[PDB]
Amino acid sequence: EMVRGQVFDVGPRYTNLSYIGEGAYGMVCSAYDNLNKVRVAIKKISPFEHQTYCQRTLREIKILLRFRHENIIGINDIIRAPTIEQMKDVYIVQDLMETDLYKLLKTQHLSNDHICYFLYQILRGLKYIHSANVLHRDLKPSNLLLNTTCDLKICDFGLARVADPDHDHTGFLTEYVATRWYRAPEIMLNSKGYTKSIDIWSVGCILAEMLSNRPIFPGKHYLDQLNHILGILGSPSQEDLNCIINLKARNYLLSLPHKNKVPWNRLFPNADSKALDLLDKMLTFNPHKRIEVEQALAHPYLEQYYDPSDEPIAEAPFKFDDLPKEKLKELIFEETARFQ
Numbered sequence: 001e002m003v004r005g006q007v008f009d010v011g012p013r014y015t016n017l018s019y020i021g022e023g024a025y026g027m028v029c030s031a032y033d034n035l036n037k038v039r040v041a042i043k044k045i046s047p048f049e050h051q052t053y054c055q056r057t058l059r060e061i062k063i064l065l066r067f068r069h070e071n072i073i074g075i076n077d078i079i080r081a082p083t084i085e086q087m088k089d090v091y092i093v094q095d096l097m098e099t100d101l102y103k104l105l106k107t108q109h110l111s112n113d114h115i116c117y118f119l120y121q122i123l124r125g126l127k128y129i130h131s132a133n134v135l136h137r138d139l140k141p142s143n144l145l146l147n148t149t150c151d152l153k154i155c156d157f158g159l160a161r162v163a164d165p166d167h168d169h170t171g172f173l174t175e176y177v178a179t180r181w182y183r184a185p186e187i188m189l190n191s192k193g194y195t196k197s198i199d200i201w202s203v204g205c206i207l208a209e210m211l212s213n214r215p216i217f218p219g220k221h222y223l224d225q226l227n228h229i230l231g232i233l234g235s236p237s238q239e240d241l242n243c244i245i246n247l248k249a250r251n252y253l254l255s256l257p258h259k260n261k262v263p264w265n266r267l268f269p270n271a272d273s274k275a276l277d278l279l280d281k282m283l284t285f286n287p288h289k290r291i292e293v294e295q296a297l298a299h300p301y302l303e304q305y306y307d308p309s310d311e312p313i314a315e316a317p318f319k320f321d322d323l324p325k326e327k328l329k330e331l332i333f334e335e336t337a338r339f340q
């Protein structure tokens with residue numbers, strides 16, 4: 001069958017296709033799985049015309065095949081031609097979810113009980129990812145899927161990287177890829193986004209969004225983003241400026257008139273007080289003082305859900321993090337053999 005003028009050769013195991021979502025290099029559809037008797041999500045990927053989408057495809061497949069967690073999307077099946085030459089697209093079968101947090105946030109008011117449960121699930125998923133030495137780098141509401149009982153799952157590992165704190169520093173205003181509204185401020189100033197602290201910042205942004213149903217730092221352009229953050233957080237202290245050695249970055253910060261911190265209580269007067277305290281910790285301008293994932297789970301805001309024993313970590317971390325689209329087709333092919 002075909003969806004929206006796109007051929008969908010996922011037969012014959014899956015039938016009754018329905019459109020779900022779209023990607024730059026692909027399309028997401030719903031279908032009935034005959035061999036398991038339930039509805040599922042199938043993701044048609046055609047990345048072979050670009051070396052960039054291939055990296056993402058490879059990255060994503062390798063990670064998801066290696067991860068196994070309640071709060072992380074899994075791969076049920078991988079469909080593709082039986083030969084290198086015939087392989088035009090690749091179909092990823094996954095559990096069908098009811099919605100995503102992005103959609104939910106535009107239509108629904110979240111109760112405190114919901115915010116707490118969702119935050120806990122994101123943290124539980126995040127802890128497992130960070131324990132594998134992996135950075136997601138693209139956490140946002142659209143990448144968080146929900147089912148009808150409010151089980152949360154993390155998806156889209158295309159931009160994921162192995163953590164590299166040693167190689168993180170960079171110059172002022174260095175190009176980034178991740179979604180702007182969830183960019184930590186150090187990305188703009190001196191960071192490549194090779195630390196776990198970047199995911200924490202995005203999750204803080206997600207917390208604020210769940211609190212108000214609006215993005216907290218909706219910057220129009222790359223540097224605009226910085227101003228949105230500083231507008232709320234206020235001018236960084238001396239200690240935090242001392243952490244930024246690049247003169248271009250430091251001098252820009254010094255050139256800004258002093259900005260006073262806007263209290264969270266003023267921004268979210270209906271918010272739970274324990275929630276706002278955690279929000280403050282996650283949205284800390286200094287990455288080094290920013291709360292870590294395990295500490296966040298231990299915060300009193302989440303105490304009704306906190307159980308260290310029931311928050312697993314990865315068995316095998318990722319050891320290490322130019323290939324043309326050709327050799328990238330070969331690997332994807334090699335990584336997908338399991339399912340044929």
Ligand SMILES: O=C1c2cc(-c3ccnc(NC4CCOCC4)n3)[nH]c2CCN1Cc1ccccc1
Pocket residue numbers: 020021022023024025026027028041043044045094095096097098099100103145155156
């Ligand atoms: O990967 C995805 C993906 C996975 C799902 C998904 C999975 C499970 N279940 C549901 N259910 C949906 C029901 C309706 O409300 C929303 C969730 N969606 N959706 C998307 C849209 C974004 N892309 C990006 C992408 C797509 C193709 C190629 C490259 C990249």
